[model samples]
Target chain A: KKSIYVAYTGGTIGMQRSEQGYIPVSGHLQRQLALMPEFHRPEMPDFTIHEYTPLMDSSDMTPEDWQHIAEDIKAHYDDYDGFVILHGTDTMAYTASALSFMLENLGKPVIVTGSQIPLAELRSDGQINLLNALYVAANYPINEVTLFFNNRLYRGNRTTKAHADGFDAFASPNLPPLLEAGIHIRRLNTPPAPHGEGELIVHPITPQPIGVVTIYPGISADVVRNFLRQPVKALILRSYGVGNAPQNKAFLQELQEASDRGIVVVNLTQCMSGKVNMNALAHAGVIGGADMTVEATLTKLHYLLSQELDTETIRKAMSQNLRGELTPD
Target chain B: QKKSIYVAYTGGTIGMQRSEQGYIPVSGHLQRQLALMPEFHRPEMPDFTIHEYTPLMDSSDMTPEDWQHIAEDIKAHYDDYDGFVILHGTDTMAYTASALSFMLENLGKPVIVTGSQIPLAELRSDGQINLLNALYVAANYPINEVTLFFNNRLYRGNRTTKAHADGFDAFASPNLPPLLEAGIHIRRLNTPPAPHGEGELIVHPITPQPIGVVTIYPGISADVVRNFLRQPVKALILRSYGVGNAPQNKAFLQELQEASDRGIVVVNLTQCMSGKVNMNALAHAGVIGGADMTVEATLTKLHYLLSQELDTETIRKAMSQNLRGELTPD
Candidate 1:
């Protein structure tokens, strides 16, 4: 019998009624399924449900919650051949990226699925999310963590929550989905992971010490001064065209002094499509000293922060892919 | 009386003098020597003469001060001639291109900069292309704009660069194409604007200090940065691999932040010829003014700043100019 473990962490997919208001039905999902013998009959795959106590709204999901989820998967890594997770769509991309980093050497499907509408709603998206997750967990050779939603299964790192109120809530720009379920179930070729270690390494460390800074016209020195004075360990400067800053003296002095004091300053681009360039231009050339790395402007700050180090190490690390924040530079 | 202009003959392989040590002279001397040729003696081309700099050598020996000397000479002779042309070295043409783009702007006559690896003294010299074209275009072109005469081609002042070191022509702008190319005729591909309006022509009173940063290997935090901050004034640029990436630690952030906070204008640039900068990514979204900022390339930004204008207004203006019509179509 093909056996699978379903971990329902709670979201609209598991929403059901109670005196306490709309609560997750994940804990009683098995009981509900058992009553509907037609759905959980022997002909279907033999599955187990493990739901977390209480429950959470998608917005309440946190990095620490991710750690708990990662630990659970690691513990049951050998016990099950495949797993399905009913997650919150609100921060699905973050959870997916966080897991991609946490779940090392994953050779079994860890499908994260959720929906926009409640499970009991007529023609709900949850039913499809659940069915597809189960179907993918049963048939596909999906060895990495993924998001199975809106009839498409995406590689976890490439995804982002593009819509707050759409059935197709997520989209990955770097690559297409691994599988699109409809009248047919098609699978995409999975690229080999460079860190193809055989053993799973669940990293429990994440530092939330980084933040983003946007560049615009009429930006003041006081804002710059206040931000620098706030004792930020590192800052991301979204520079304009081909990575140039002002050639005026105060600007260079600010950047130079910040580096002298051991603060890491990263320069990212302002545009949507291109990467950061550090040379051949003067504004960035003269004063943008110390250590520098031109990052893909499309990455999440949390991912970059988790990997921060001194200049030399950060340079190589930023260019290299970790999780799916970006592809190999 | 016709206007007289000085042509600095720097040393280059174009004018190689054979010696046991090696080829001992410079190249790219076509304008002066070729002026003696019967073809250039006609008066219709405008009456102008060349004044060679003292004992000129190669363009490689060129320094920032040399750039100043070159600029000052033209400034001193600003009105005597209808136009001026400086024959420069090929190896540092991009650097020269960038410098000249910032140095010369807004005038009534052209100040065209050109150079060749093969000398006017040689049979297969590129000097003729730069020299003859620079002079004709300088005197005849409707607008008074800076131009780079290279590889039988002419480009707008700020848009051109020496892309290849070894070839008959080694310059191009992939983002923006050339303004003019040479063949059976000197064909103009596009016409870039001459400085318009009442923008005055004046020598830059400001001096710039030069600092360089190169990225390679397991890049250290301050390998390219440590010495850059010690000096004051002038300009700075950031050169990144592929695009740009820097560490997310205190060491690297502080360097750029502190430098900018001190009123020094820090320009960010890509290591690539094709792409421009965008700091929207998480790692660098917070970068903005301390002194002032510019999004233009190294050459254009510097040239624009050297002229007197509001730093903020000019930063906005220069960045906005689609100026010189570099991005425009013919």
Candidate 2:
């Protein structure tokens, strides 16, 4: 019998009605699950739910929260067959991407999921999302961090919150979903093999100062100059189609100076679906983030920054496919 | 029936001539190149008059005023031509397409905006196919609104964005489907919405409006928003996380609220390419929801509205409305 370990972190799935709005409350998710017969039915795998203290709204979550979740999974790696993480939908993709990079090497399946509506509300999606996440974690362990939502299982780092209010909220634009749930759970894409044969190594990430600059018409170079004034270790340039920026001399000079100062600048396309072609920007000393979501790129940068590697190595690794976050040339 | 088309050979990679500095926009080179091409002069093809701008510009150097120039030029020759084709730089083609959509009100003729990844003079350039099809579509299929044609697909102007940095198929319409797809046979995939007002073409004059775009990522500080608001920005586009979420930081909320209170149009547009903004999610006072509008469309739409003498409240209301098919109807 397979037994799954679930980390019920705070999100809309576990929220209760409050005067202000639906807010995360202690023991509410457990109480709601206990009354539901689907979670306790025959043929379902045995599971244990470990709720985090002072459940988060997801919007309030940060790098510290991601580290905490990673450590929790590491501490209980040997005790469970697979792990299921219940998160808020807002930042769920970010957390999933963070975990995909943090949990390196030999691993069991780790599925992240959340609902658009709270369990306490009428017509809520929490029950279906949680039930499927638990079932998939036990039955099909893909040995990777994946997100199950709207009956589709996507690679953690490839997914993004594509919809703001719809039930089909998440999308893996550049890549296809790993599995799609219909009458039966169907595997669509093959999951990558574990990095190496070893125990799961949880890389502890510290909060690093990162800046993102989105290019637009009539944008001033001062925007980049003022942003670089801060001690930002990495700058994510969300550039125009295929990593093109305006031919503004001042803007290019600012980025060149930053590169000279050893800051890791990444040229990521602002487009939702396509990968950044770095041929146009070959002259610039910036790494091309090929089809990685902003969520994944940010988290991957944090994971790399945590390691005691040199700046050049980090830049090179960013362009390479690490943990399937990006497609390398 | 033979149709006469007007081609606006604006500065872009399609008509550039080789120079010591690589490909640079040159006058009369594109006309000469077109005259020599037998395909463009075939009896089945429509007759075209190419008017190259005196000082050609790369699309990166294009501004709202340039969009105005293109619109005025089209209106100047509205009755003389059956349709129009604009050759623009791929870098900012989507923005120009969107601006033209709003500026040319009650457009009853097809206006296809297109450009190429590689210069026409270069080997294996996409310029020939892109420009040829754009001109062909403008003369044959009347989309009756601003549209973008590239890589054998026709998309509504404001719904499209340049998805690829260097591919021949460089544009994508995420939320909406393409209007037409060209193959051995031209097929219409979707129909464009009819022009709203029934009248002669009206070119709404546009002036430059200072707009700031802020993209949200994890660990972003409120100082970013503060610094953007510090500028004399007329509007702010918050490219927020999935479903329009920002860090629930008090300072970040405060900066946005202050900007809203100051009559600055703060729009909550999702960073995702496909999703609409859930206004109920980010229900802060004074922030308007930009539902499913691309960054290009949102920026240009704001310019179109802010250029008018309308008050701030009207502009806020208009941002949410489906004007010029830029946004999905509620």
Candidate 3:
């Protein structure tokens, strides 16, 4: 009999109706789950919901929260056959991507999931999202971090919140989802990463300062210059049309200075679905973030910065396919 | 029995000539290259005239004033031509198309914005096919609104975004499907909005306005919000996390609230490529939710609204509603 360890981190899935709006309350999710007969079915896996103290609104989650979740999983690494993480949809992709990098060589399945609606609310998607995440974790272990939502299982780093009010909230734009839940849960693409040979090693992440700058018409170079003035270690330049930026001299000069100062500058396409193809900025030591979502790129930068690697090594690793966060050319 | 189509060669890769530095727009170069191609002069083709801009511009350098010039050009010849084709750069073509959609009020003739990833003078160029198809569609099938045609697909101008950087199929309409697809034959997947009671074309002028965009991420300091509001920005596009959620930081909320209190149009748009902002899902007071519209549409639509005599509340209300099929309302 398979068993699962659930980290019921706060989100709308467990939120209760308050005078202001839906708010995360301690023990509320557990109470709701206890009353539901579906979770008590024989075929369902034996699960323990470890309710976090002072459950958080996902919008309030930080890098420290990610480290906490990583440590929580590592502490109970061998106690359960698989793990399920209940997260809020707002920054669900960010947390999922962060965990994918934090939990290195993860052998057992780790599924992160949440709902747009509360479990107790009318027409809540929480039951289906949580039920499927539990079932997928206990039975068909994919040996990687993945996000399950709206009948689809996406690689953790590949998914983004694609819809706001709709039940289908998450989407993996560049990569196809790993599994599709229909009458039968069918696996589509190959498993994300090869299973590791050794035990799971959770990497400790220290929060780092990273800046994100989005390019638009008439965007001044001073915007980037001012952002770099901050003690930011890395910069994510959201460029236009496949990683192209305005051929502004001052802009290129600012990026070159940033590179020379040992700051890692990454060029990512602002478009929803394209890979960066232009290398004009590479001469300035700008790394090309090919096809990685803003969430993945940002979190992956934090993961690398926390390591004892040099700036050049981190820059090289960013362009490479680490944890399947980036697609190989 | 040929319809006359007016070609506004505004400038882009389609008109750019070979330069020692790289492809750069040059006067009379596009027409010279077109003269060498016999397909443009065929019997089935439409009668066309090219009106080139004096100093061609790269799409990256485009602004609201450029959009106004394009709109005025189309309005000037609205009755003389059956349709209009605009040659623009791929970088800001979607923005230009979106701005035109809103600026050209009550448009009842085909206005297609198109460009090429490669120059027309280069080998294996996509300009030939893109321009040829655009002209044919403008003359034959009239979609009585501004649209963008690329990679054999015609999209509603305000609904499209540049999805690819180097590929021929560069544009995609994420929330809505293509208006028309050019396969073995041109197929209409979606119908264009019907003309509103034979209304005449009215060109709304646009002036450059200060706008700011802030993307949310973990550890993003509230100082960033404070810095943006400190500028002379008339509007702020808060590219928030999934479903329009931001960090519940007191300072960040204070900065946004102060901006709203000062009558600055602070709108919350999703950082995701294809999602609407449901402020109701995670209600934040004093911030208007920019419903399912691309960044291109939202930015240009703000420019269109800000240029008018409407107040801040009117502009905020217009943003949430569907004006010119730019957004799906709540």
Candidate 4:
């Protein structure tokens, strides 16, 4: 008897032929879902799809777009028991991470998912991705934002888009998956989702200029300086193994200067797996150590920075566990 | 064509029993246990010989000298054995496998490096399956690669990374696909295995070269890095940030460049379990140019390359090259 609301936020799932390629078209997804017999099965949860206005391919989505989706869920919080977001695969992780922060104290499921292959394809992955998201949203009591892809459900913030073409494009490398969809759904050692007693809050996220500085061999101090210049609120300094940066005095000075200037610099690792351990570095303080994906970190920074808190407060909040965005150990 | 496996039973969890303290390995007990196991003596199982190391130490204590000893053992009986299986500790098995891959050149027979996460005595121990499958693959498959057979997948040693501590799926080859996955049928990957018996078995003499890894972390003290990069060590694995990145620090690059100048092969590697170290993308290319080494490959290739009497520049070149399925050409 559970009713799940699906926000068909235009992705590969709603594929329609265009001159360039199969594109997301309005009303097309709804029509396709109506025809699907699985969605109408007795055990299947009752659901409704709200086609987003001026639907966008998730790759082109921004913070404003995430806010829109978050608001939609908030507005319809009471109407539906659980919600499913049909997002594009490219930037699905980003939106999921953003939504995890945006929908504060959510007590219902917000399963974000999309297909790598368009549903129009004879051997499409979209149908299964969509179907599973619906099933999990209705059945599982998981209240957190999760991305269900390729029969696996991962915490939205923890998941990362690892591959370009494969069906198994997403991965939660640092943390194990929340739930695995197989013959029997396997709920891992992850904590159960928190139930929200208060009203679901749609926190506003402003477009703050956050720069990501990924260091490589022979990178000049000037280019780093150029990126770390004023007007940027925060920086995600992607460093080598376990959050290591070259012990360059000049580089250390730049980070120190930024810290002094009220810019929150988070130390994130370039490695897909493992957390940043800042104990090794001489200058940079340990931040983003508990294994937050760059997408999750960026979204988290945006969420915290939008709250109008001081840089120090923002930095402290960023490091602490907020909505399971970080492990914080 | 008869099947024979030369098992270099270097100590690991497979042959251990739960004593008063913990699972302590007893020497002669492993062979007897195998002899008693019905699956091992079946017609499907290969004719085998277990050469136990005199002092079977834990893999964490395994050093470059031990790698040399294991390589020499395999080389000594090359003519007599059709295949080889090294029972190693899971702690540093990936590094060992990677080391063996570089040492054994023109290797035609399957050299499967395997170990159990739990002791065979435990009910849920993976020792029986892992050992049995390792032998099965070593005898039948023509994969001429030093592969770490764990759980069910056969991964190239140089590409393997120890992924999980407690899970049965302990290892992953992030950059490469597995050679085989044991299921209803032993599924093989589309990528062709190494050509069998293409040339003479050349087991290069591995020296006890001092090579160590220095993982750069945020705010890492320069003095600590300096200590690690200093002296007696022929090479250093500079685990940089994503895709071979270091802080655009002058003194940092200066230290690394000085090391390079001092004939130290400082290999660049990513701290991430998966991905490549590409110096060409980031800045300070002058600092750690020859450091575009994968985490697993850098550790082992250094062991092999340093053991040889080759010059610094040659070692750097060979380290970057796709030797024995270690590195993918950039």
What are the per-residue Cα lDDT tens digits for candidate 4 across B127-183? 766787888888876588889998678988877878877544388888778989864
**What TM-score does candidate 3 reach?**
0.50
lDDT at residue B166 of model 3 (Cα atoms): 45
The iRMS of model 1 comes to 40.2
lDDT of 2 at A314: 92
lDDT against the true structure, per candidate, is 0.59, 0.83, 0.85, 0.78
**TM-score-based ranking:** 4, 3, 2, 1
For candidate 3, give the lDDT: 0.85
The 10-residue segment of model 3 chain A with minimum total lDDT is: A119-128
How much lDDT does candidate 2 score? Answer: 0.83
Off by over 4 Å in 3: A165-168, B1-330
- For candidate 3, the per-residue lDDT at B261 reads 86
Tens digit per residue, CA lDDT, model 4, A230-253? 789888888887876776767676
Candidate 2: residue A222 Cα off by (Å): 2.2
**How many steric overlaps does candidate 3 have?**
0
Model 3 lDDT tens row, B11-31: 887878876899776779888
True lDDT of residue B147, candidate 1 = 67
Could you estimate the TM-score for every candidate? 0.44, 0.50, 0.50, 0.51
Q: Distance (Å) between predicted and true CA of A79, model 1?
A: 0.5
User: Looking at candidate 1, what is the lDDT of residue A63?
Assistant: 70
